[PDB]
């Protein structure tokens, strides 16, 4: 089966597990730092997503280091995952052109 | 059924010190968090620290004396929390609550009461 | 560290009457704020959460509202059942903390 679609997907599942893990992580690292709202679990999922797809609002940001670590882990997971769509469809529109000339 | 049992009374010598239980039941999750506050007779509470069993972290009131220390034993479902070299100062009603990490205290013990004296 | 202010420390209300408890915080917290009670020689529980959602098992008769640093938490028909201490509780920002407590008192 075509390689850029399954890494496609393998690309959502994974995204999926690291906003999960990284709302358990972030709300795990900033809770004992005085100030910090990355605190609770539903939000701090919405703060991963936020992340992930690089929307970043401002509401909720992370304050320590290891939450600004698993931050970054989440940006860069949010954009390889994208990016990896991006270049699926590049794919799938060369194969695609090449059919409509012939080869 | 109870959800957060805690013996009734400790009796702590001056300078001694005692380790408070609180055995949970009931629905228990990856994100529960274990709180204490102590009260003093007449008074408010006061949040003393937390923990989070499935991890073992714990975070403390930085604006008061620590003089407590928490561990969880994940077999037993059991949150204990040391308090130690006690003075008079330390007598009161000391709570466990659960939170499901959503900032709240669903459910509270009914209460260990510390009495140090000698 | 979230400051919350409850005043009145101490509410007189007639039998049946509406009261309201207020609770001041010190800097904007949405809606991250909940209420509990706390009878003679009871544990504290929960009454409202997240300023005004209701919990089942609570009468009907309590009710939050507010946001931002302004908020009340209100009994409609008080009665004798109702008579504690009421506590308002953040969890915006860490560490979580508590407010100083509102007794009420009905006047039979």
């Known amino acids: 089966s075509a390689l850029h679609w399954r890494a496609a997907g393998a690309a959502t599942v994974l995204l999926v597990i690291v906003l999960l893990a990284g709302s358990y992580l972030a709300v795990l690292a900033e809770r004992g730092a005085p100030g910090a709202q990355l605190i609770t679990y539903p939000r701090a999922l919405w703060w991963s997503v936020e992340t992930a797809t690089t929307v970043g609002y401002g509401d909720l940001c992370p304050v320590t280091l290891w939450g600004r670590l698993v931050a970054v882990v989440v940006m860069v997971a949010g954009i390889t995952s994208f990016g990896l769509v991006t270049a699926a469809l590049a794919t799938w529109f060369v194969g695609r052109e090449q059919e409509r000339r012939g080869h | 059924q109870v959800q957060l049992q805690q013996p009734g009374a400790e009796l702590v010598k001056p300078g001694a010190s005692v380790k408070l239980s609180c055995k949970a039941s009931g629905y228990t999750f990856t994100s529960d968090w274990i709180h204490w506050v102590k009260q003093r007779p007449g008074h408010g509470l006061e949040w003393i620290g937390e923990i989070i069993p499935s991890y073992g972290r714990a975070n403390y009131n930085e604006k008061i004396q620590k003089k407590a220390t928490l561990t969880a034993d994940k077999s037993s479902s059991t949150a204990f929390m040391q308090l130690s070299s006690l003075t008079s100062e330390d007598s009161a009603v000391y709570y466990c609550?659960?939170?499901?990490?959503?900032?709240?205290?669903?459910?509270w013990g009914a209460g260990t009461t510390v009495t140090v004296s000698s | 560290d979230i400051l919350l202010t409850q005043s009145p420390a101490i509410l007189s209300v007639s039998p049946g009457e509406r009261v309201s408890f207020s609770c001041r915080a010190s800097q904007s917290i949405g809606t991250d704020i909940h209420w509990y009670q706390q009878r003679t020689n009871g544990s504290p529980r929960l009454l409202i959460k997240?300023?005004?959602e209701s919990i089942s098992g609570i009468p009907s008769r309590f009710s939050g509202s507010g946001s931002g640093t302004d908020f009340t938490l209100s009994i409609n028909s008080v009665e004798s059942e109702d008579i504690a201490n009421y506590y308002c509780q953040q969890s915006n920002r860490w560490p979580f903390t508590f407010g100083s407590g509102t007794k009420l008192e009905i006047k039979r």
């Open positions: 997240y300023a005004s």
């Open positions: 609550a659960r939170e499901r990490g959503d900032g709240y205290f669903a459910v």
